[PDB]
Amino acid sequence: MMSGRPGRVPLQFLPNEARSLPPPKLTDPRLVYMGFLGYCSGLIDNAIRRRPVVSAGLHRQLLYVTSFVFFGYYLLKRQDYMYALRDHDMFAYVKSHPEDFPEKDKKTYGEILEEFHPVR
Template sequence: GVHRQVLFTTVGWFVGYYLTKRTEYIHAKLDRELFEYIRQHPGDFKATEKKRIGELLEDFYPVR
């Protein structure tokens, strides 16, 4: 009946909420580890010069 729908909706919401929190935690932990590695090894990650968008894209020639 309706009570099962409410129960399953509530359980699904809580499971989704905690799975979302867990994935956010795992990604934040990975980001922290990677940024720490980059901070400790700056020679491996040299900053490149910034390019303008016009330098990255090819010239556009419309086909008719």
């Protein structure tokens, strides 16, 4: 779908047109879940390595957390930019092809005859 999109330069995680969108907030629920994933990784690291799972290596658990949040922020930016691109192309295509997307003639339920099915 999006592979051969025009202007799509290779090996570029965020293109420069993404800087027009709002960056994700720092307390973004998805970013906080990223940090939680890092914290779980640190706890499981203590468990497998046979260390006290909660209080051993606070620097290591902390680094797990911050690296997970660091990757999550950029992942969120790229995801949001891809969805913005999707909506951008969809609206452009609906605009360029009005015949494929007609203006449906709206009618009220007072003139629309819906069939009644009794429950009995």
